[model samples]
Target: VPETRPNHTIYINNLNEKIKKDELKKSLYAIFSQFGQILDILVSRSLKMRGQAFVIFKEVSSATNALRSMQGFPFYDKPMRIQYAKTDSD
Candidate 1:
């Protein structure tokens, strides 16, 4: 069975893999938190999905704003690619 994800969730990629998870989380929180309340952050380490993360904001508007503002923004010396995340149901 497929599940639907909320509109407030966003996908970010092209992160520097050398950074530790905690450090990356802190930096992500510092930057994305300014737009709105962050409900959750998921950093992936699967062999097929490294250097990627998902951020869930409390509001859909905030996610949209962040996605718009953060594309090509530098994080850990790499430009981050941001987009709306699609769930299995999508």
Candidate 2:
């Protein structure tokens, strides 16, 4: 594996139950674009069937910047939560 920045692992929570990949990607872009940098993205479904997801961004600063601005905002009629990713081995 190559050396990667720790910031490459960012986590966004509280995704809408009905959200789709395109919408998720769009939402992430909308948030991170404010910081002027785009990062990789990862999205997965919750096994428990909850209307939630896991979103990972590529840069720590970008994640932090987005969290500061969009953490409490509405996305697709649902509030969003943002945070640092807990691990790299997803």
Candidate 3:
């Protein structure tokens, strides 16, 4: 089932396949912890590799704020693409 929530979801795509989930979590926590608060984190990974993860903040505003602050910023030596995610039952 697809996940749905009232808070704005952040979908980070085109991520490098070499980054670890824990590393991503730490980096994201650092970013989100700057403003408002981070309720939780949901990271999706392939069984074959370790590369991508999706983060969900406690509030839509927090996610949006993080997006503005994080997008285009370099992480792990690579630029990150952050945005609010669409809620769909796919």
TM-scores of the candidates in the order shown? 0.86, 0.67, 0.72
Ranking by TM-score: 1, 3, 2
Rate residue 5 of model 1 by lDDT: 45
Question: For model 3, which pairs clash?
Answer: none
lDDT of each: 0.83, 0.61, 0.67
Off by over 4 Å in 1: 1-6
lDDT tens digits by residue: candidate 3, 6-62: 346677755666767777778777866876766676666766434455677677877
Better of 1 and 2 by TM-score: 1
Q: Model 1: per-residue lDDT, tens digit, 23-72?
A: 88889999999889998888866776678898989899998888878889
Q: lDDT rank, highest first? A: 1, 3, 2
lDDT of 2 by residue, 2-90 (tens): 12334545556677867677677777676567665564565555466344444455456655666667776787777776665566476
Number of colliding residue pairs in model 3: 0
Worst 10-residue lDDT window for candidate 3 reads 1-10
User: Judged by TM-score, which candidate is best?
Assistant: 1
Off by over 4 Å in 3: 1-7, 47-50, 88-90
Runs with alpha carbons beyond 4 Å of true place in candidate 2: 1-6, 45-58
TM-score computed on alpha carbons, candidate 3: 0.72
Query: Which RMSD does model 1 reach against the true structure?
Result: 5.0
